Design a protein around this ligand. Structure first.
Ligand SMILES: CCCCC/C=C/C/C=C/C/C=C\C/C=C\CCCC(=O)O[C@H](COC(=O)CCCCCCCCCCCCCCCCC)COP(=O)(O)O[C@@H]1[C@H](O)[C@H](O)[C@@H](OP(=O)(O)O)[C@H](OP(=O)(O)O)[C@H]1O
Ligand SMILES: CCCCCCCCCCCCCCCCCC(=O)OC[C@H](COP(=O)(O)OCCN)OC(=O)CCCCCCCCCCCCCCCCC
Ligand SMILES: CC(C)CCC[C@@H](C)[C@H]1CC[C@H]2[C@@H]3CC=C4C[C@@H](O)CC[C@]4(C)[C@H]3CC[C@]12C
Ligand SMILES: CC(C)CCC[C@@H](C)[C@H]1CC[C@H]2[C@@H]3CC=C4C[C@@H](O)CC[C@]4(C)[C@H]3CC[C@]12C
Ligand SMILES: CC(C)CCC[C@@H](C)[C@H]1CC[C@H]2[C@@H]3CC=C4C[C@@H](O)CC[C@]4(C)[C@H]3CC[C@]12C
Ligand SMILES: *[C@@H]1O[C@H](CO)[C@@H](O)[C@H](O)[C@H]1NC(C)=O
Ligand SMILES: [Ca+2]
Length: 1260
């Protein structure tokens, strides 16, 4: 019984769990205690489910008498279920603790054991991501205290009219202003900046205390709605200083933390790859490839001799086999597939009548030919030889689908969805002529071999989304019903809608807009109501982790196997071909000063180009640097002339000519405004690029990026090919359907003319006449190019929820929207994001990582010296003892003993934390007593810290105190905090930001953090030219945008406003930074479309001549290029720091030997390294075992062995430091034998690590 269980008592319980999961989805949360019959039936099925669970709990309890975590989860689920049922019966919130049933779907993981393994693989590589979760916590706290000492309470005023107010006439979205004494936004002509305002977003986005700032900093770190906060601060305090906060916050907490996380994950995924390689899981894929090749390579013997004729069907088969494989049916079927793609991609909205007949007759004349080829494939090759090859099973699928989908279209049952578009996948056969086919086939082979892993990793992601959908639906079900007219399409009302909302939060787009709604649904910016943001924070930070541990893992662990498979094929082909052939047949220009001065002049010209006035034309600034170009080109013209005589042509020299030329052929037009000038000026922007050839190190990175982009071409091509098919499907589904009338009552263009009355702010007593306009969506699936653009801006995760809910409403061509007509059409978008936004954009990053790893693994000197032994011997050869400065004076000795110990350091580490806590309690609306208490507390803390500084200066003396890098930054904080006090007793805030900087001392202590940060910082410093490509790209694109879109008028109702414009180089760079962050960049692109008003200053013809059609190729290309360059820099840093990222810490290394160096300490002061004799005899006693030894007996055979390890060329009296080092390194690992003393000296000297005679101190 209590052991009888059985086997079928689990499978029954699992089915009950699934039934509970389904019954939890049909439930509909109603707004205000409403209900229907289905909910009443589910409330009684819950009783049966609880009875079953209680019976299970009791039976399992009496078999064991529960220590397992899963059993504990079951127990605490059933107990709280009983509690909820009893409380509901008693009270006849009780209906809030039913949110423990959304935890029942977790029992599915308990049931199937193939998912427990994957769940452990998921939350086991999270422990490494705990030194990057603490750095994030420190950065958020530091920036929240800094923005609290800078922006506390400064965003509580807005324009209010000068009549009957209390309303904010600052338009539908009010923005903070400033009184006419500061430098913030000034109210309009007929408005007044008055205090007494709630806040920018109902009071949730503020810096009023260390609860509202900790959330604003997190939201800005997630790179969502950070420009909104930056602009709100810009409209409240000024525009000069606030950008330094929000730019550094994202550079450090969103572009460096992301790099750290990516590096740790990519180094963590390589250890398991090594473990699998040691176990030998790649062999199974290796054998399957060759055996399948031979199992198809030997079928020709059967098929070529199946029709031996010693009735007469040989008439055709003896030539059908040749004809269909004679390089004619290849280039003819490819041509037919090209024609089919032509007829599929030529369908737009409102096409001519002949085109729809051409595409109706070709779609049949080509299907007939493909079916004829189908029957010929079955005949000339045989049935089995047809269904061997993978491409030959998908082609049968496509042809049978075409045949079965013509019927549905001709019989008028369902509307076309796109089926023949899968025939364009056959265009991949073009790769067979080049070498980019073995890798592509191998990648698909690995993807198909790993299916029980992909479909199992996606199952936990689906379970996560389902669980967080039911929990969110219980929390916010029906509570999003606000009085305002907006329907709030992203709610938690049903299961499909709550799934869409959770998926949108997972992608991250507008994740803060849903949380701002879930906060007001539980009250407002109050204490208990706002504790609901923990749901969204946890969902975001635990969904974007599984989204990087499920997709990047697949991409990396499959693309690493694909490379090994391709290498195997290449090696086998090379060996076989080699065997076959062998077996069968047997001037002052070149000076430094000129180059350096020309490089300096290049920078001068670039800065002169970046300082031009975009909007203004007749200005003095556009004259001086419009005149310095005259002299500037004179030097550059000269430079070519006297260097021409040294030659009689490299491509860089041709570029420098071109450049010098434009300039030249420009101030000579001196008349032809006729564009020309204005299309020859936007070509000076090539100046920076003439420094590539004169800045060796900058040419190398350009060449490396060119090799990288040549290598990654297959991924881009097969991603564009897939996006094309998705665009064609979108055209089939949504052509001419996403049209809307301004009046939401007319569903026809002929019905959408005239005017209509709209009521402002949903007030029936405030009528307003507005015109009726039949308008399309911002991005529409009308033709194939518009579909491509819309899908691109969907894959960038920008504005995709708007397009999704506009596509859901569309029902018929030339008709308006219908609320939630086809919600099921969201599957198209979900699939697109899953494939083209989560999988294919991670395959590219995995490919970059794998290629860089292969480049780094090329030879590595390939000569012994195990991967740690290089550093071990290098350190044993270039390690010197460290200074200690034991005080000589007897009093200074006691003082330095006081400040050198755990007590003083750990008490300072407590005072620092107390000071930060005291800095954290700073609300908006503090009493005078609170503030004057804070002042005295700050004075006391700074007095204590300056007394600590005095003590340290006295103990360590002024060279010793100042030598430590951490005691020179402590001096600056003390001076700033000591200037702060005196200036507070009568630019004062610049010194108030010094005290909060003392918190970094706590981040300094403790390994892990201090090692990862240092290694990544020195990796960023080791590659200063990879990060200069991004600077060059930003400069060039900012100048181009400045020249093109400079003159667009700044209306605050559009996306080119006072805050976002191209009218200055800093502002253009900020706009490009925002676009790189991916913050409504498509809105800026649309606001830069042709047909806008020019600025009043920039010069009738001025109807709408501002804005160019260049915006598409500007913004899309900038996005792609910036993403490529950022990923290049990230992976370059990761691979430069790939020793720390995978170190296998159970072995010796820098951690186990820098300890040594220290452990020498005592037995040494200033350098020297001479032993006490009694050190070599007390060693192990402190040294740790996994490196040296474990506190055991000095004569332990193994420790006496440490004595057997004797003089390595020195003197027993005083070991020359390094001595013991090597000795300990040699005994720890790579133990050699007797007589291998100069043999080791040549084991290093003969290949690498030039000794430089140093063996004078190490011989034997
Ligand atoms: C940027 C501005 C400032 C930061 C504070 C200070 C600058 C002045 C600094 C003195 C520190 C320099 C000394 C230093 O080296 O610092 C590092 C830590 O580096 C960080 O993590 C540095 C952590 C900094 C993180 C800053 C993020 C906070 C946000 C900035 C807020 C700024 C916002 C302002 C907004 C203004 C709006 C108006 C500490 O020491 P270490 O990690 O380098 O390691 C030492 C040593 O360097 C040896 O080289 C090392 O040997 P190996 O590792 O084997 O090579 C030994 O390491 P192990 O014992 O573990 O084996 C250690 O003996
Ligand atoms: C790695 C790649 C990183 C790329 C760079 C990241 C982003 C850096 C953004 C730097 C510029 C930010 C925009 C900015 O400075 O704001 C413009 C604002 C102009 O203000 P204004 O209209 O004059 O109104 C004054 C009100 N009293 O500001 C000013 O008042 C002028 C401030 C000048 C800032 C110069 C620094 C720019 C460095 C670019 C390189
Ligand atoms: C190799 C294949 C995929 C090439 C595809 C190109 C052809 C089929 C497509 C791509 C973009 C298409 C154009 C997109 C938009 C318009 C505007 C309108 O006036 C209808 C026709 C027209 C002009 C389309 C004609 C067909 C078109 C040119
Ligand atoms: C841990 C993840 C999965 C979910 C986190 C949910 C828990 C920790 C949070 C999120 C939403 C929170 C609720 C939000 C608002 C209110 C209303 C008020 O009466 C105070 C408590 C109460 C009811 C909170 C209790 C705690 C709560 C339920
Ligand atoms: C990226 C490399 C080129 C460094 C950039 C430095 C140069 C191009 C930048 C840095 C500081 C900038 C200046 C900062 C402030 C102003 C005042 C503004 O009213 C007109 C532009 C002007 C005068 C900027 C021109 C461009 C500028 C000189
Ligand atoms: C934005 O620009 C001006 C500023 O008032 C004005 O024409 C209008 O508000 C906006 N432009 C258009 C074309 O609506
Ligand atoms: Ca966004």
């Amino acid at each position: 019984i209590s052991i009888v269980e059985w086997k079928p008592f689990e499978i029954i319980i699992l089915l009950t769990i699934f039934a509970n999961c389904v019954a939890l989805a049909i439930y509909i949360p109603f707004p205000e205690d409403d209900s229907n019959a289905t909910n009443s039936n589910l409330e009684r099925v819950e009783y049966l489910f609880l009875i079953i669970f209680t019976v299970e709990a009791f039976l399992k309890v009496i078999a064991y008498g529960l220590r397992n975590g899963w059993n504990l989860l079951d127990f605490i689920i059933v107990v709280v279920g009983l509690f909820s049922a009893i409380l509901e019966q008693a009270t006849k919130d009780v209906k809030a603790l039913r949110a423990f049933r959304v935890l029942r779907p977790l029992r599915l993981v308990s049931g199937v054991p193939s998912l427990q393994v994957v769940l452990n693989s998921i939350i086991k590589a999270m422990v490494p991501l705990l030194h990057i979760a603490l750095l994030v916590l420190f950065v958020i706290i530091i920036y929240a205290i800094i923005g609290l000492e800078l922006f506390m309470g400064k965003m509580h005023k807005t324009c209010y009219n000068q009549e009957g107010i209390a309303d904010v006439p600052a338009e539908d979205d009010p923005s903070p202003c400033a009184l006419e004494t500061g430098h913030g936004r000034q109210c309009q002509n007929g408005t007044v900046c008055k205090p007494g305002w709630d806040g920018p977003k109902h009071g949730i986005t503020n810096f009023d205390n260390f609860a509202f700032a900790m959330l604003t900093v997190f939201q800005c770190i997630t790179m969502e709605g950070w420009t909104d906060v930056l602009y709100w601060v810009n409209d409240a305090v000024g525009r000069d200083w606030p950008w330094i906060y929000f730019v550094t916050l994202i550079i450090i907490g969103s572009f460096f933390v992301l790099n750290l996380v990516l590096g740790v994950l990519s180094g963590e995924f390589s250890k398991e790859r090594e473990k699998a390689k040691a176990r030998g899981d790649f062999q199974k894929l290796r054998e399957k490839q060759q055996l399948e090749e031979d199992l198809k390579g030997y079928l020709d013997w059967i098929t070529q001799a199946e029709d031996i004729d010693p009735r007469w069907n040989r008439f055709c088969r003896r030539k059908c086999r040749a004809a269909v494989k004679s390089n004619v049916f290849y280039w003819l079927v490819i041509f037919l597939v090209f024609l089919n793609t032509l007829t599929i991609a030529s369908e737009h909205y409102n096409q001519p009548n002949w085109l729809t007949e051409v595409q109706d007759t070709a779609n049949k004349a080509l299907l007939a030919l493909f079916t004829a080829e189908m029957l010929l494939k079955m005949y000339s090759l045989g049935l089995q030889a047809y269904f061997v090859s993978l491409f030959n099973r998908f082609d049968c699928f496509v042809v049978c689908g075409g045949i079965l989908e013509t019927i549905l279209v001709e019989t008028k049952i369902m509307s076309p969805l796109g089926i023949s578009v899968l025939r364009c996948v056959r265009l991949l056969r073009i790769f067979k002529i080049t070498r980019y086919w073995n890798s592509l086939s191998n990648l698909v082979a690995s993807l198909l071999n790993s299916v029980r892993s992909i479909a199992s990793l996606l199952l936990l992601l689906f379970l996560f989304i389902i669980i967080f959908s039911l929990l969110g639906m219980q929390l916010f079900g029906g509570k999003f019903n606000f009085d305002e007219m907006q329907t709030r399409r992203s709610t938690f009302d049903n299961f499909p809608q709550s799934l869409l909302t959770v998926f949108q939060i997972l992608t991250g787009e507008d994740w803060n807009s849903v949380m701002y709604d879930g906060i007001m649904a539980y009250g407002g910016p109050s204490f208990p109501g706002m504790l609901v943001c923990i749901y969204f924070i946890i969902l975001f930070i635990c969904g974007n982790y599984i989204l990087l541990n499920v997709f990047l893992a697949i991409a990396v662990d499959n693309l690493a196997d694909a490379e090994s498979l391709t290498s195997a094929q290449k090696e086998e082909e090379e060996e076989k071909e080699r065997k076959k052939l062998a077996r069968t047949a047997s001037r002052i220009v070149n000076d430094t000063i000129f180059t350096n001065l020309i490089l300096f002049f290049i920078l001068l010209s670039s800065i002169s180009l970046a300082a031009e006035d975009p909007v203004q034309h007749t200005s003095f600034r556009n004259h001086i640097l419009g005149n310095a170009d005259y002299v500037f080109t004179s030097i550059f013209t000269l430079e070519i002339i006297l260097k021409m005589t040294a030659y009689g042509r490299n491509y860089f020299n041709i570029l420098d000519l071109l450049v010098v030329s434009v300039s030249l052929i420009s101030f000579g037009i001196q008349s032809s405004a006729i564009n020309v000038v204005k299309i020859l000026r936007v070509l000076r922007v090539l100046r920076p690029l003439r420094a590539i050839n004169r800045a060796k190190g900058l040419k190398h990175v350009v060449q490396c990026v060119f090799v990288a982009i040549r290598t990654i071409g297959n991924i881009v091509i097969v991603t564009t090919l897939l996006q094309f098919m998705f665009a064609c499907i979108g055209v089939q589904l949504f052509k001419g359907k996403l049209y809307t009338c301004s009046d939401s009552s007319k569903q026809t263009e002929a019905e959408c003319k005239g005017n209509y009355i709209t009521y402002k702010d949903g007030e029936v007593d405030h009528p307003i006449i507005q015109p009726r306009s039949w308008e399309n969506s911002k991005f529409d699936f009308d033709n194939v190019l518009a579909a491509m653009m819309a899908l691109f801006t969907v894959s960038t995760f920008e504005g995709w929820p708007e397009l999704l809910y506009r596509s859901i409403d569309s029902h018929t061509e030339d008709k308006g929207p219908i609320y939630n007509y086809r919600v099921e059409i969201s599957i198209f978008f979900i699939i697109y994001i899953i494939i083209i936004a989560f999988f294919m954009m991670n395959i590219f990053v995995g490919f970059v990582i794998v290629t860089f790893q292969e480049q780094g693994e090329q030879e590595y000197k390939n000569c012994e010296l195990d991967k740690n032994q290089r550093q071990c011997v290098e350190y044993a050869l270039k390690a010197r003892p460290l200074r200690r400065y034991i005080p000589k004076n007897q009093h200074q000795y006691k003082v330095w003993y006081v400040v050198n110990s755990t007590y003083f350091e750990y008490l300072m580490f407590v005072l620092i934390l107390l000071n930060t806590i005291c800095l954290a309690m700073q609300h908006y609306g503090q009493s005078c007593l609170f503030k004057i208490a804070m002042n005295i507390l700050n004075m006391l803390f700074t007095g204590l810290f300056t007394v600590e500084m005095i003590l340290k200066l006295i103990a360590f003396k002024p060279k010793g105190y100042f030598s430590d890098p951490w005691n020179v930054f402590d001096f600056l904080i003390v001076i700033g905090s000591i200037i702060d006090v005196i200036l507070s007793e009568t630019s004062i805030t610049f010194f108030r930001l010094f005290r909060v900087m003392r918190l970094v001392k706590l981040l300094s202590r403790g390994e892990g953090i201090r090692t990862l940060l240092w290694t990544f910082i020195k990796s960023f410093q080791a590659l200063p030219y990879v990060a200069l490509l991004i600077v060059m790209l930003f400069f060039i694109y900012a100048v181009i945008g400045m020249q093109v879109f400079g003159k667009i008028a700044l209306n605050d109702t559009t996306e080119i406003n006072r805050n976002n414009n191209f009218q200055t180089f800093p502002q253009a760079v900020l706009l490009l930074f925002r676009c790189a962050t991916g913050e409504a960049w498509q809105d800026i692109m649309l606001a830069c479309m042709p047909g806008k008003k020019c600025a009043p200053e920039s010069e009738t013809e001025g109807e709408t001549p501002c804005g160019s059609s260049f915006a598409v190729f500007y913004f899309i290309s900038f996005y792609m290029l910036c993403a490529f360059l950022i990923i290049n820099l990230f992976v370059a840093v990761i691979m430069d720091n790939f020793d720390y990222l995978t170190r296998d810490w159970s072995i010796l290394g820098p951690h186990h030997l820098d300890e040594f160096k220290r452990i020498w300490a005592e037995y040494d002061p200033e350098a020297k390294g001479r032993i006490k004799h009694l050190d070599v005899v007390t060693l192990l006693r402190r040294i740790q075992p996994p490196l040296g030894f474990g506190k055991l007996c000095p004569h332990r055979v193994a420790c006496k062995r440490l004595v057997s390890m004797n003089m390595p060329l020195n003197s027993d009296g005083t070991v020359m430091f390094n001595a013991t080092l090597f000795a300990l390194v040699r005994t720890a690992l790579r133990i050699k034998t007797e007589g291998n003393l100069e043999q080791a000296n040549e084991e290093l000297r003969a290949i690498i690590k030039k000794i430089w005679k140093r063996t004078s101190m190490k011989l034997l």
